[PDB]
Amino acid sequence: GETHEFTAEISQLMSLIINTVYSNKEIFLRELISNASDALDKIRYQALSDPSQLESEPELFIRIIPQKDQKVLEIRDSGIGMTKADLVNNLGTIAKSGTKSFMEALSAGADVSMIGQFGVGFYSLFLVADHVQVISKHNDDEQYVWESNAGGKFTVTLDETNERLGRGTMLRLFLKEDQLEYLEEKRIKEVVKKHSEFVAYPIQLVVTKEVEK
Ligand SMILES: CC1(C)CC(=O)c2c(C(F)(F)F)nn(-c3ccc(C(N)=O)c(N[C@H]4CC[C@H](O)CC4)c3)c2C1
C-alpha cells in the first residue's frame, strides 16, 4: 500500500491542467484512446514473436463504461498493461522527458491539445476529472491499482478489490461536476467519431438502460 511523490515537473503539469479553463476538454478522450491504442500496438507486437503473450486475454479492444451512479467514466483496454515497476516509476524518466518542453510550449501559445506529442497525454484526464484510479495487469506481474487525487502524492496497491482485467489497463475518472456530459452515450459517441477515425481497434461503449416492462 505504498505512497509515492510526483516529480516537480509532473506536479507542475497536473496543476496546470486541472486548473486550466481550456474549453475543448473533449480531447482528454482522444488522448486516453491513443494511450490505449499504443498499449494494444505493443502487445500485438510482442505477441507476434511470442503468441502465448495473448493467452491472458485474446481479445484486443478498447471499451468505455460510463458509471452514472458514481459519476465515474471508465476506459479499459486489453493492451500490454503495466507492471508494478511501471506504475511506481510513472514509466521512468524517458517517458516523461517532454513534460518541461510541453509546459514551455504552453507558455509560448500552444494548444493544450498537442500534449500527446510530448508523450504525456495521460495527464489530460485532469481536464475533466479531479481524481483517477489506474488498474493494470501486465503478463509479467500481478494486478495493481495506481491512484491520484491530483496532489503531490499517489499510491500503488496490489489489486484485491477490482474485476480481473486479464491483461491491460482500466482508467476510472472521477468526473468534475461540470463535466458530466461525458457520461452520456450521445456525447461519448460524438467525441469518438470526431477524434478516433484512425484507431485500428474496436472501440466499444457500454450503456446501461432500464427495461420498459
Ligand atoms: C503510469 C501512469 C499511471 C502515470 C504516468 O505517468 C503515465 C504516462 C506518461 F506520462 F508517463 F507517459 N503514460 N501512461 C499511460 C496510461 C495508460 C496507458 C494504457 N492505457 O495502456 C499507457 N500505456 C503504455 C504503457 C507502457 C508501454 O510502453 C506502452 C503502452 C500509459 C501513464 C500512467
Structure description:
By secondary structure, the protein is α+β, with helices and mostly antiparallel strands. The protein has a single domain, classed as 2-Layer Sandwich (Heat Shock Protein 90). 29% of the residues lie in helices and 22% in strands. The chain has an eight-stranded mixed beta sheet. A hairpin with a 4-residue loop joins strand 5 (144-148) and strand 6. It starts with a strand and ends in an 8-residue tail after the last strand. Bound molecules: the ligand CC1(C)CC(=O)c2c(C(F)(F)F)nn(-c3ccc(C(N)=O)c(N[C@H]4CC[C@H](O)CC4)c3)c2C1. The ligand CC1(C)CC(=O)c2c(C(F)(F)F)nn(-c3ccc(C(N)=O)c(N[C@H]4CC[C@H](O)CC4)c3)c2C1 is lined by residues 35-36, 38-39, 42, 77, 79-80, 82, 86-87, 90-91, 95-96, 119-120, 122, 134, 146, 169. Ligand E0G binds next to helix 2 and helix 3. The PDB classes it as chaperone. Keywords: Hsp90. ATPase, chaperone. The assembly is monomeric. Candida albicans Hsp90 nucleotide binding domain in complex with SNX-2112.
- Portion of residues in beta strands equals 15-25%
Distinct compounds present: ligand E0G
CATH class: Alpha Beta
Helix share of residues? 25-40%
Shape: globular
Distance between the termini: 46 Å
* Secondary-structure element pattern, one letter each: EHHEEHHEEEEHE
Number of domains: 1
CATH topology-level name: Heat Shock Protein 90
> By helix and strand content, what is the structural category?
alpha+beta
Protein name: Heat shock protein 90 homolog
Subcellular location: Cytoplasm
Binding site for ATP: 35, 77, 96, 122
Subunit structure: Homodimer.
